[PDB]
Fold Grainyhead-like protein 2 homolog.
Amino acid sequence: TFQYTLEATKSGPMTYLNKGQFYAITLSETCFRHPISKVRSVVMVVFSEDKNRDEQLKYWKYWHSRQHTAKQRVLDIADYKESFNTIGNIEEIAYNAVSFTWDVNEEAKIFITVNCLSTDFSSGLPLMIQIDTYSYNNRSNKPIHRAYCQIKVFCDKGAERKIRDEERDITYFKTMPDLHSQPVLFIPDV
């Protein structure tokens, strides 16, 4: 039914990202007829190991306390026209999540960045990008589709250096069979 891609450095799905560098995510629907065209997707940065909720909010507060500004988010979205013409209703619902609506009859394009290094949760944690797709025609707490992509976030072009060291373009997200489980989203006290 649905399919998402991440345009990054080539490494289920695992991708190496550089902190503060924007990467293109594409949202597409592989059943819909006007006016039934829109869906609402949630792009998140959550932990892979599936630790308890309280553990996950512990790593986020530790990370958040070590930032130079309280306004610093884990996940950020770029305002580029290529993206903003294809998507609507952009909401920064949490520090590690972005919400937007997109038309299934088109292909959605977003540029995102991860501002946490995989090594920032100790003095490397398996992180992942999760995409939740919801119906726009109901207030259900259950997505119609889920998909993930494991990520490793580096600094100073570390992603390229890791690939280069391994040696010495598009990654498809893997569909998550559980629509019941809830992602741990972080919002600090401001």
